[PDB]
Amino acid sequence: GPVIGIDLGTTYSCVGVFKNGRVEILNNELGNRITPSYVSFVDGERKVGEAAKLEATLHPTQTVFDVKRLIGRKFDDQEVVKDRSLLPYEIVNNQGKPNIKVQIKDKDTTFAPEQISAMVLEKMKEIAQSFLGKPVKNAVVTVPAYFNDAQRQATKDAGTIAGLNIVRIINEPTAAALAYGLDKKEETSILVYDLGGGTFDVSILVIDNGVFEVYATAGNTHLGGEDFDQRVMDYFIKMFKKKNNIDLRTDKRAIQKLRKEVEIAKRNLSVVHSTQIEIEDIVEGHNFSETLTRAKFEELNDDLFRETLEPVKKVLDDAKYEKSKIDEIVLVGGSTRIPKIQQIIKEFFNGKEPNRGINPDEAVAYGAAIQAGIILG
Numbered sequence: 001g002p003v004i005g006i007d008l009g010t011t012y013s014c015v016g017v018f019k020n021g022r023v024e025i026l027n028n029e030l031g032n033r034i035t036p037s038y039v040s041f042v043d044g045e046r047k048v049g050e051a052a053k054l055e056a057t058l059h060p061t062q063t064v065f066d067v068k069r070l071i072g073r074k075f076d077d078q079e080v081v082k083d084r085s086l087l088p089y090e091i092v093n094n095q096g097k098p099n100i101k102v103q104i105k106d107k108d109t110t111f112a113p114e115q116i117s118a119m120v121l122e123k124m125k126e127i128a129q130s131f132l133g134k135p136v137k138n139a140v141v142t143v144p145a146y147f148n149d150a151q152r153q154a155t156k157d158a159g160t161i162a163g164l165n166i167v168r169i170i171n172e173p174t175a176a177a178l179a180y181g182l183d184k185k186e187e188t189s190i191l192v193y194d195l196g197g198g199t200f201d202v203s204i205l206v207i208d209n210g211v212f213e214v215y216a217t218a219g220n221t222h223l224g225g226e227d228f229d230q231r232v233m234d235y236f237i238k239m240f241k242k243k244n245n246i247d248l249r250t251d252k253r254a255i256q257k258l259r260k261e262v263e264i265a266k267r268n269l270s271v272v273h274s275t276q277i278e279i280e281d282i283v284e285g286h287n288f289s290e291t292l293t294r295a296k297f298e299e300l301n302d303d304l305f306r307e308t309l310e311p312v313k314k315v316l317d318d319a320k321y322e323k324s325k326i327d328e329i330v331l332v333g334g335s336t337r338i339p340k341i342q343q344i345i346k347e348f349f350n351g352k353e354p355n356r357g358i359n360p361d362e363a364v365a366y367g368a369a370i371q372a373g374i375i376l377g
């Protein structure tokens, strides 16, 4: 049978197949190559992906996301205590482990993290199955290099619930090395800098005659593209209050519309220098119309950009590496498209150019699909 490759991400997932000698990253029913890792439980219906994410504004307690932060952990872990205080859906203690509690037709229903991840894996599986016109029973799935045996086992259990035999778990740095086709002969020391929507990871991966080993890993579980958006939102909410005496935080729908346009403005500012953020009637009778420059975008976030270097220094220290010991810097995650990020990394490595792909959000799923093709022979 076929083996598909799945990047089961914190904020999004991505599925790839290896077919007639090529990796195809598959579109979901809405024509997107990434699917928000969201599940909503509203009004008797269960939604997965973008339709679930759209429920978050009006139904925040019923809209489950970021489950990768909880999977295989214990309720009293310091990281889980912090996430319970940040997440708006209820998390309960089931025999020492965090479970998610929501309502289905008003009834309390409790899910293990792996049961929510299984629903994401199931949607990825169905995209594969319709594209291939065939049942899919087998997958390669990625995990962070820092995942322990309990986090990896709960990811495998999510696969089993979704009807997927996870034939191989590979770490995200290895998946990236496979996608960029890093030559497997002789020895190479690679820095994998992975800046996503919600999380920052950096690893030293060494490739030695086809054997991949992560020698050190560090990161920031609360640093990603969504934080850069929030810095911009905070700025424009303050400006709109100064000019119009309207605090947009008093209207959750206004906030949702602004957040969509701010996200789009950020992405544009990876290519242009100036972009317009426009919402007609952001509240009734008031239009939102502003210009954001790349220079103001960077000024609002420059402390967060520079914080990404603290994990880089830590993995170099943990591995006892000199900066020069790094042979190649590889960039993963759409947030590495930010010009200032690529500049800061270049300068930290006393001038060495980072390798970035063209589709940095799909690189991990691409590599998982390559690993699937390697296993099939």
Ligand SMILES: Nc1ncnc2c1nc(NCc1ccccc1Cl)n2[C@@H]1O[C@H](CO)[C@@H](O)[C@H]1O
Pocket (backbone or CB within 6 Å): 034, 196, 197, 198, 224, 225, 226, 263, 266, 267, 268, 270, 333, 334, 335, 336, 337, 338, 361
């Ligand atoms: N040009 C960009 N400049 C800065 N940050 C970016 C850019 N593209 C993405 N991502 C790709 C993506 C997002 C939405 C729709 C389609 C795609 Cl393929 N990011 C950021 O990467 C993170 C995970 O997508 C998000 O925080 C996102 O905002």
